[PDB]
Design a protein around this nucleic acid. Structure first.
Lengths: 188, 187
DNA sequence: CCCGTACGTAGAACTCGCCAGTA
DNA sequence: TACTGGCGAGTTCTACGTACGGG
Protein backbone atom coordinates (compact mmCIF):
# COMPACT_ATOMS: atom_id res chain seq x y z
CA UNK A 1 0.00 0.00 0.00
CA UNK A 2 0.91 3.71 -0.29
CA UNK A 3 0.51 6.30 2.48
CA UNK A 4 -2.90 5.11 3.59
CA UNK A 5 -2.72 7.40 6.64
CA UNK A 6 -3.76 10.49 4.67
CA UNK A 7 -6.71 8.78 2.99
CA UNK A 8 -7.78 7.27 6.32
CA UNK A 9 -7.84 10.68 8.01
CA UNK A 10 -9.91 12.04 5.10
CA UNK A 11 -12.36 9.14 5.33
CA UNK A 12 -12.54 9.33 9.13
CA UNK A 13 -13.35 13.05 8.99
CA UNK A 14 -16.13 12.22 6.50
CA UNK A 15 -17.47 9.35 8.69
CA UNK A 16 -17.36 11.18 12.07
CA UNK A 17 -19.52 13.99 10.75
CA UNK A 18 -22.21 11.58 9.50
CA UNK A 19 -22.26 9.29 12.57
CA UNK A 20 -20.91 11.26 15.56
CA UNK A 21 -17.94 10.26 17.68
CA UNK A 22 -19.66 7.56 19.74
CA UNK A 23 -21.62 5.98 16.88
CA UNK A 24 -18.66 5.93 14.52
CA UNK A 25 -16.97 2.57 14.67
CA UNK A 26 -13.73 1.03 13.61
CA UNK A 27 -15.84 -1.53 11.79
CA UNK A 28 -17.47 1.30 9.79
CA UNK A 29 -14.14 3.07 9.21
CA UNK A 30 -12.50 -0.12 7.91
CA UNK A 31 -15.62 -0.81 5.80
CA UNK A 32 -15.62 2.62 4.12
CA UNK A 33 -11.84 2.73 3.66
CA UNK A 34 -12.04 -0.83 2.27
CA UNK A 35 -9.16 -1.84 4.54
CA UNK A 36 -9.17 -4.32 7.39
CA UNK A 37 -9.38 -3.11 10.99
CA UNK A 38 -5.93 -4.54 11.94
CA UNK A 39 -4.23 -2.45 9.20
CA UNK A 40 -6.05 0.63 10.49
CA UNK A 41 -4.67 -0.26 13.93
CA UNK A 42 -1.27 -0.67 12.26
CA UNK A 43 -1.50 3.03 11.41
CA UNK A 44 -3.26 4.36 14.57
CA UNK A 45 -2.81 2.46 17.81
CA UNK A 46 -5.96 4.02 19.32
CA UNK A 47 -9.21 5.69 18.31
CA UNK A 48 -8.28 8.76 20.40
CA UNK A 49 -5.00 9.34 18.56
CA UNK A 50 -6.87 9.36 15.24
CA UNK A 51 -9.45 11.73 16.66
CA UNK A 52 -6.78 14.17 17.91
CA UNK A 53 -5.04 14.10 14.51
CA UNK A 54 -8.32 14.95 12.72
CA UNK A 55 -9.12 17.73 15.21
CA UNK A 56 -5.62 19.20 14.86
CA UNK A 57 -5.89 19.18 11.06
CA UNK A 58 -9.17 21.10 11.17
CA UNK A 59 -8.00 23.62 13.78
CA UNK A 60 -4.85 24.43 11.79
CA UNK A 61 -6.95 24.84 8.63
CA UNK A 62 -9.07 27.45 10.33
CA UNK A 63 -6.32 29.18 12.40
CA UNK A 64 -3.75 29.73 9.67
CA UNK A 65 -6.54 31.24 7.58
CA UNK A 66 -7.67 33.49 10.42
CA UNK A 67 -4.16 34.74 11.25
CA UNK A 68 -3.38 35.40 7.58
CA UNK A 69 -6.67 37.28 7.27
CA UNK A 70 -5.99 39.37 10.41
CA UNK A 71 -2.51 40.42 9.20
CA UNK A 72 -3.71 41.94 5.86
CA UNK A 73 -4.74 45.45 7.08
CA UNK A 74 -5.04 47.83 10.04
CA UNK A 75 -8.40 49.30 8.79
CA UNK A 76 -11.08 48.00 11.25
CA UNK A 77 -13.69 47.66 8.49
CA UNK A 78 -11.09 45.78 6.48
CA UNK A 79 -9.92 43.44 9.22
CA UNK A 80 -13.57 42.81 10.09
CA UNK A 81 -14.32 41.77 6.54
CA UNK A 82 -11.17 39.64 6.15
CA UNK A 83 -11.95 37.71 9.33
CA UNK A 84 -15.61 37.11 8.46
CA UNK A 85 -14.55 35.99 4.96
CA UNK A 86 -12.04 33.56 6.48
CA UNK A 87 -14.82 32.13 8.64
CA UNK A 88 -17.27 31.62 5.77
CA UNK A 89 -14.53 30.14 3.56
CA UNK A 90 -13.73 27.63 6.31
CA UNK A 91 -17.34 26.60 6.91
CA UNK A 92 -18.03 26.14 3.19
CA UNK A 93 -14.92 24.15 2.16
CA UNK A 94 -14.29 22.11 5.32
CA UNK A 95 -17.80 20.97 6.19
CA UNK A 96 -16.35 18.19 8.36
CA UNK A 97 -14.28 20.66 10.42
CA UNK A 98 -17.37 22.82 10.90
CA UNK A 99 -19.39 19.87 12.22
CA UNK A 100 -16.49 18.64 14.45
CA UNK A 101 -16.08 22.06 16.12
CA UNK A 102 -19.72 23.08 16.62
CA UNK A 103 -21.29 19.62 17.08
CA UNK A 104 -18.50 18.09 19.15
CA UNK A 105 -19.61 14.93 20.91
CA UNK A 106 -16.68 13.83 23.08
CA UNK A 107 -16.13 16.48 25.81
CA UNK A 108 -15.38 13.75 28.44
CA UNK A 109 -11.77 13.41 27.14
CA UNK A 110 -10.02 16.68 27.97
CA UNK A 111 -7.48 16.47 25.18
CA UNK A 112 -10.50 16.79 22.86
CA UNK A 113 -12.00 19.74 24.70
CA UNK A 114 -8.57 21.39 24.80
CA UNK A 115 -8.16 21.18 21.01
CA UNK A 116 -11.65 22.68 20.63
CA UNK A 117 -10.87 25.41 23.16
CA UNK A 118 -7.56 26.30 21.50
CA UNK A 119 -9.35 26.58 18.15
CA UNK A 120 -12.11 28.78 19.61
CA UNK A 121 -9.51 30.88 21.52
CA UNK A 122 -7.42 31.57 18.40
CA UNK A 123 -10.46 33.25 16.82
CA UNK A 124 -11.26 35.08 20.03
CA UNK A 125 -7.64 36.23 20.34
CA UNK A 126 -7.54 37.60 16.81
CA UNK A 127 -10.70 39.66 17.16
CA UNK A 128 -9.96 40.73 20.78
CA UNK A 129 -6.40 41.82 20.10
CA UNK A 130 -7.55 44.18 17.37
CA UNK A 131 -10.38 45.58 19.45
CA UNK A 132 -8.17 45.96 22.56
CA UNK A 133 -5.34 47.78 20.74
CA UNK A 134 -7.74 49.96 18.75
CA UNK A 135 -10.20 50.66 21.64
CA UNK A 136 -8.44 50.97 25.02
CA UNK A 137 -11.45 49.56 26.97
CA UNK A 138 -11.57 47.09 29.90
CA UNK A 139 -9.53 43.95 28.95
CA UNK A 140 -12.17 41.58 30.36
CA UNK A 141 -15.01 43.29 28.46
CA UNK A 142 -13.14 43.32 25.17
CA UNK A 143 -12.67 39.53 25.26
CA UNK A 144 -16.35 39.02 26.04
CA UNK A 145 -17.32 41.25 23.10
CA UNK A 146 -14.86 39.44 20.80
CA UNK A 147 -16.38 36.09 21.82
CA UNK A 148 -19.85 37.41 21.12
CA UNK A 149 -18.73 38.61 17.69
CA UNK A 150 -17.14 35.26 16.80
CA UNK A 151 -20.17 33.37 18.06
CA UNK A 152 -22.51 35.60 16.06
CA UNK A 153 -20.51 34.92 12.89
CA UNK A 154 -20.51 31.14 13.43
CA UNK A 155 -24.25 31.05 14.20
CA UNK A 156 -25.12 33.10 11.08
CA UNK A 157 -22.94 30.74 9.07
CA UNK A 158 -24.65 27.69 10.57
CA UNK A 159 -28.04 29.17 9.68
CA UNK A 160 -26.90 29.79 6.10
CA UNK A 161 -25.46 26.27 5.67
CA UNK A 162 -28.40 24.46 7.33
CA UNK A 163 -30.82 26.36 5.03
CA UNK A 164 -29.15 24.84 1.88
CA UNK A 165 -27.48 28.16 1.04
CA UNK A 166 -30.64 30.15 0.23
CA UNK A 167 -28.52 33.26 -0.51
CA UNK A 168 -25.05 33.83 -1.95
CA UNK A 169 -21.93 33.82 0.21
CA UNK A 170 -21.35 37.43 -0.81
CA UNK A 171 -24.83 38.28 0.48
CA UNK A 172 -24.29 36.38 3.75
CA UNK A 173 -20.96 38.15 4.33
CA UNK A 174 -22.34 41.60 3.51
CA UNK A 175 -25.30 41.07 5.87
CA UNK A 176 -22.99 39.99 8.69
CA UNK A 177 -20.60 42.91 8.09
CA UNK A 178 -23.42 45.49 8.00
CA UNK A 179 -24.85 44.02 11.22
CA UNK A 180 -21.44 44.03 12.95
CA UNK A 181 -21.01 47.68 11.94
CA UNK A 182 -24.38 49.28 12.61
CA UNK A 183 -25.84 46.72 14.98
CA UNK A 184 -29.50 46.32 15.79
CA UNK A 185 -29.76 50.14 15.92
CA UNK A 186 -29.79 50.41 12.11
CA UNK A 187 -32.17 47.50 11.35
CA UNK A 188 -35.50 49.42 11.49
CA UNK B 1 -44.14 12.05 48.04
CA UNK B 2 -43.33 11.76 44.33
CA UNK B 3 -39.57 11.21 44.14
CA UNK B 4 -39.74 11.94 40.39
CA UNK B 5 -38.84 15.61 40.87
CA UNK B 6 -35.73 14.87 42.94
CA UNK B 7 -34.74 12.21 40.45
CA UNK B 8 -34.85 14.76 37.62
CA UNK B 9 -32.67 17.09 39.67
CA UNK B 10 -30.19 14.29 40.39
CA UNK B 11 -30.14 13.14 36.75
CA UNK B 12 -29.40 16.71 35.62
CA UNK B 13 -26.55 16.84 38.18
CA UNK B 14 -25.08 13.57 36.94
CA UNK B 15 -25.36 14.48 33.25
CA UNK B 16 -23.65 17.82 33.80
CA UNK B 17 -20.78 16.41 35.93
CA UNK B 18 -20.09 13.31 33.80
CA UNK B 19 -21.63 13.99 30.36
CA UNK B 20 -24.34 11.94 28.70
CA UNK B 21 -22.27 8.98 27.57
CA UNK B 22 -20.32 8.55 30.82
CA UNK B 23 -23.40 9.05 32.97
CA UNK B 24 -24.95 5.81 34.09
CA UNK B 25 -28.17 4.77 35.72
CA UNK B 26 -26.03 3.25 38.48
CA UNK B 27 -24.47 6.66 39.27
CA UNK B 28 -27.84 8.47 39.16
CA UNK B 29 -29.44 5.94 41.52
CA UNK B 30 -26.38 6.17 43.80
CA UNK B 31 -26.51 9.97 44.13
CA UNK B 32 -30.31 10.01 44.52
CA UNK B 33 -29.93 7.32 47.23
CA UNK B 34 -32.44 5.08 45.47
CA UNK B 35 -32.06 1.65 43.93
CA UNK B 36 -31.75 1.33 40.18
CA UNK B 37 -35.08 -0.58 39.75
CA UNK B 38 -37.06 2.36 41.23
CA UNK B 39 -35.41 4.75 38.79
CA UNK B 40 -36.48 2.41 35.97
CA UNK B 41 -40.01 2.33 37.46
CA UNK B 42 -40.16 6.12 36.92
CA UNK B 43 -38.25 6.55 33.63
CA UNK B 44 -38.24 3.61 31.24
CA UNK B 45 -35.13 4.65 29.32
CA UNK B 46 -32.00 6.72 29.68
CA UNK B 47 -33.09 8.60 26.57
CA UNK B 48 -36.50 9.22 28.09
CA UNK B 49 -34.92 10.46 31.33
CA UNK B 50 -32.52 12.68 29.41
CA UNK B 51 -35.31 14.09 27.23
CA UNK B 52 -37.41 14.78 30.31
CA UNK B 53 -34.50 16.67 31.89
CA UNK B 54 -33.82 18.54 28.65
CA UNK B 55 -37.46 19.44 28.19
CA UNK B 56 -37.65 20.79 31.72
CA UNK B 57 -34.63 23.01 31.10
CA UNK B 58 -35.78 24.22 27.69
CA UNK B 59 -39.20 25.19 29.04
CA UNK B 60 -37.37 26.96 31.90
CA UNK B 61 -35.38 29.11 29.48
CA UNK B 62 -38.03 29.74 26.81
CA UNK B 63 -40.86 30.82 29.13
CA UNK B 64 -38.54 33.33 30.79
CA UNK B 65 -37.45 34.70 27.41
CA UNK B 66 -40.98 34.92 25.97
CA UNK B 67 -42.36 36.60 29.11
CA UNK B 68 -39.47 39.08 28.88
CA UNK B 69 -40.38 39.82 25.26
CA UNK B 70 -44.03 40.57 26.18
CA UNK B 71 -43.17 43.28 28.80
CA UNK B 72 -42.65 46.19 26.39
CA UNK B 73 -42.70 47.31 22.76
CA UNK B 74 -39.59 49.52 23.14
CA UNK B 75 -37.29 47.34 21.03
CA UNK B 76 -34.16 48.45 22.92
CA UNK B 77 -35.95 47.47 26.13
CA UNK B 78 -37.04 44.09 24.85
CA UNK B 79 -33.45 43.54 23.74
CA UNK B 80 -32.30 44.15 27.28
CA UNK B 81 -35.09 42.12 28.88
CA UNK B 82 -34.41 39.10 26.69
CA UNK B 83 -30.64 39.13 27.13
CA UNK B 84 -31.09 39.61 30.91
CA UNK B 85 -33.51 36.65 30.95
CA UNK B 86 -30.85 34.58 29.17
CA UNK B 87 -28.12 35.48 31.65
CA UNK B 88 -30.57 34.86 34.51
CA UNK B 89 -31.22 31.37 33.11
CA UNK B 90 -27.55 30.54 32.77
CA UNK B 91 -26.84 31.68 36.33
CA UNK B 92 -29.57 29.86 38.24
CA UNK B 93 -29.98 26.63 36.33
CA UNK B 94 -26.27 26.22 35.73
CA UNK B 95 -26.72 22.57 34.74
CA UNK B 96 -29.26 23.41 31.97
CA UNK B 97 -27.02 25.78 30.03
CA UNK B 98 -24.42 23.02 29.82
CA UNK B 99 -26.98 20.29 28.94
CA UNK B 100 -28.40 22.30 26.02
CA UNK B 101 -25.23 23.89 24.62
CA UNK B 102 -22.71 21.16 25.62
CA UNK B 103 -24.96 18.34 24.45
CA UNK B 104 -23.28 14.96 23.93
CA UNK B 105 -26.07 12.85 22.40
CA UNK B 106 -26.33 14.09 18.78
CA UNK B 107 -27.04 10.47 17.58
CA UNK B 108 -30.72 10.70 18.71
CA UNK B 109 -32.59 13.27 16.62
CA UNK B 110 -35.42 13.86 19.11
CA UNK B 111 -32.76 15.39 21.38
CA UNK B 112 -31.42 17.61 18.63
CA UNK B 113 -34.98 18.53 17.64
CA UNK B 114 -35.83 19.74 21.15
CA UNK B 115 -32.61 21.83 21.10
CA UNK B 116 -33.43 23.24 17.65
CA UNK B 117 -36.98 24.17 18.68
CA UNK B 118 -35.67 26.01 21.74
CA UNK B 119 -33.22 28.04 19.69
CA UNK B 120 -35.85 28.61 16.96
CA UNK B 121 -38.58 29.87 19.29
CA UNK B 122 -36.26 32.68 20.43
CA UNK B 123 -35.11 33.32 16.90
CA UNK B 124 -38.72 33.34 15.64
CA UNK B 125 -39.73 35.92 18.26
CA UNK B 126 -36.82 38.21 17.40
CA UNK B 127 -37.42 37.77 13.65
CA UNK B 128 -41.13 38.58 14.05
CA UNK B 129 -40.27 41.77 15.90
CA UNK B 130 -37.67 42.86 13.33
CA UNK B 131 -40.07 42.19 10.42
CA UNK B 132 -42.97 44.15 11.94
CA UNK B 133 -40.80 47.08 13.12
CA UNK B 134 -38.33 47.32 10.21
CA UNK B 135 -39.82 46.30 6.84
CA UNK B 136 -36.86 43.94 6.35
CA UNK B 137 -37.57 40.90 4.20
CA UNK B 138 -37.44 37.42 5.82
CA UNK B 139 -33.92 36.22 4.91
CA UNK B 140 -32.07 39.26 6.24
CA UNK B 141 -34.26 39.62 9.33
CA UNK B 142 -33.91 35.93 10.22
CA UNK B 143 -30.16 35.98 9.70
CA UNK B 144 -29.83 38.97 12.04
CA UNK B 145 -32.09 37.30 14.64
CA UNK B 146 -29.89 34.19 14.50
CA UNK B 147 -26.78 36.31 14.89
CA UNK B 148 -28.19 38.11 17.93
CA UNK B 149 -29.22 34.92 19.74
CA UNK B 150 -25.89 33.23 19.00
CA UNK B 151 -23.94 36.29 20.17
CA UNK B 152 -25.85 36.41 23.47
CA UNK B 153 -25.33 32.69 24.23
CA UNK B 154 -21.60 32.88 23.43
CA UNK B 155 -21.13 36.00 25.56
CA UNK B 156 -22.88 34.26 28.45
CA UNK B 157 -20.73 31.13 28.10
CA UNK B 158 -17.54 33.24 28.08
CA UNK B 159 -18.68 35.15 31.17
CA UNK B 160 -19.59 31.96 33.05
CA UNK B 161 -16.42 30.05 32.02
CA UNK B 162 -14.40 33.12 33.12
CA UNK B 163 -15.99 32.82 36.60
CA UNK B 164 -18.14 35.98 36.26
CA UNK B 165 -15.42 38.68 36.25
CA UNK B 166 -18.08 41.45 36.09
CA UNK B 167 -21.61 41.82 37.42
CA UNK B 168 -24.51 40.51 35.39
CA UNK B 169 -25.73 44.05 35.18
CA UNK B 170 -22.31 44.88 33.79
CA UNK B 171 -22.34 41.78 31.61
CA UNK B 172 -25.86 42.56 30.43
CA UNK B 173 -25.19 46.26 29.70
CA UNK B 174 -22.00 45.50 27.78
CA UNK B 175 -23.80 42.88 25.69
CA UNK B 176 -26.77 45.15 24.91
CA UNK B 177 -24.58 48.13 23.96
CA UNK B 178 -22.49 45.95 21.63
CA UNK B 179 -25.62 44.40 20.08
CA UNK B 180 -27.16 47.85 19.59
CA UNK B 181 -24.28 49.95 18.29
CA UNK B 182 -21.94 47.33 16.90
CA UNK B 183 -18.23 47.73 16.30
CA UNK B 184 -18.68 51.34 15.13
CA UNK B 185 -19.15 52.39 18.77
CA UNK B 186 -16.41 50.25 20.40
CA UNK B 187 -13.40 52.63 20.46
C1' DC C 1 -45.64 -5.56 50.81
C1' DC C 2 -41.25 -3.75 49.06
C1' DC C 3 -35.75 -2.11 48.50
C1' DG C 4 -30.79 -3.43 47.84
C1' DT C 5 -27.99 -7.06 45.24
C1' DA C 6 -26.26 -9.67 41.79
C1' DC C 7 -26.71 -10.75 36.95
C1' DG C 8 -27.70 -11.37 31.24
C1' DT C 9 -26.71 -9.42 27.51
C1' DA C 10 -25.33 -6.07 23.51
C1' DG C 11 -22.26 -3.86 21.45
C1' DA C 12 -17.78 -2.43 20.12
C1' DA C 13 -12.51 -1.51 20.85
C1' DC C 14 -8.91 -4.69 20.11
C1' DT C 15 -6.40 -9.43 18.52
C1' DC C 16 -5.65 -14.94 16.07
C1' DG C 17 -6.54 -19.20 12.24
C1' DC C 18 -6.48 -18.47 7.14
C1' DC C 19 -4.07 -17.68 2.03
C1' DA C 20 -1.24 -16.03 -1.75
C1' DG C 21 3.18 -16.14 -3.89
C1' DT C 22 8.08 -18.49 -4.46
C1' DA C 23 11.97 -22.76 -5.68
C1' DT D 1 6.35 -27.83 0.06
C1' DA D 2 7.52 -23.72 3.46
C1' DC D 3 7.75 -18.52 4.97
C1' DT D 4 5.74 -13.56 5.09
C1' DG D 5 2.20 -10.84 5.92
C1' DG D 6 -2.42 -9.10 6.10
C1' DC D 7 -7.75 -10.53 7.11
C1' DG D 8 -12.55 -12.61 9.09
C1' DA D 9 -13.91 -14.85 13.69
C1' DG D 10 -13.46 -14.46 18.72
C1' DT D 11 -12.49 -11.79 23.92
C1' DT D 12 -13.36 -9.02 27.09
C1' DC D 13 -15.10 -5.02 29.40
C1' DT D 14 -18.22 -1.79 30.15
C1' DA D 15 -22.76 -0.31 31.21
C1' DC D 16 -27.83 -0.62 30.17
C1' DG D 17 -31.82 -3.12 31.72
C1' DT D 18 -33.97 -7.22 35.55
C1' DA D 19 -34.48 -11.64 39.04
C1' DC D 20 -32.93 -13.49 44.77
C1' DG D 21 -32.32 -11.93 49.95
C1' DG D 22 -34.22 -8.13 54.14
C1' DG D 23 -38.08 -4.62 56.60
Amino acid sequence: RDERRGQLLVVASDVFVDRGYHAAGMDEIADRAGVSKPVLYQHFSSKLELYLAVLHRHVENLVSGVHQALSTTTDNRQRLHVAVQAFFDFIEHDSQGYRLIFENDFVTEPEVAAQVRVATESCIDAVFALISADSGLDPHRARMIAVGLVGMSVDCARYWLDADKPISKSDAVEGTVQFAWGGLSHVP
